[PDB]
């Protein structure tokens, strides 16, 4: 019954724009950080590995270093939002948001990138 949901499963963004991909999960009362794990992945590349409040950016894949972060202000709202800055062409593809918060679910999100003069 634990369900991750996405308001959008297709993002079409410009090269060089910023982009926030939303990933929603059920938060009944206060957020219990001790229970929450967030995994963002994109085709065998690890972007976010949030564990109970702790992250090692040493494990974020190099092509996302500096450019990708979890909006941790939104997790209290049950929104594990992935913000990507200075969008690149390589960022295009299928993203997975996986949330373990007691139960576990995931959702697939497609990003398509348009080159600057298309």
């Amino acid at each position: 019954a634990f369900t991750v949901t996405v308001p959008k499963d297709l993002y079409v963004v410009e090269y060089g724009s910023n982009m926030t991909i939303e990933c929603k999960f059920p938060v009944e009362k206060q957020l219990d950080l001790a229970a929450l794990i967030v995994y963002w992945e994109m085709e065998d590349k690890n972007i976010i590995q949030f564990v109970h409040g702790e992250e090692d950016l040493k494990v974020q894949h190099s092509s996302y270093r500096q450019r990708a972060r979890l909006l941790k202000d939104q997790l209290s709202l049950g929104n594990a939002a992935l913000q990507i800055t200075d969008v690149k062409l390589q960022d295009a593809g299928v993203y997975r948001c996986m949330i373990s918060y007691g139960g576990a679910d995931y959702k697939r999100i497609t990003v398509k990138v348009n080159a600057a003069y298309a």
């Binding site: 794990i37 995994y39 992945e41 065998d44 690890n46 590995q49 949030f50 564990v51 702790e54 992250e55 090692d56 040493k58 494990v59 997975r96 996986m98 373990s100 995931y106």
Partner: peptide, 15 residues
């Protein structure tokens, strides 16, 4: 999975 520290892979998983 779920060592923060280690690298994961799909689905939870340590590739």
């Amino acid at each position: 999975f779920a060592n923060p520290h280690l690298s994961w892979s799909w689905x939870x998983r340590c590739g």
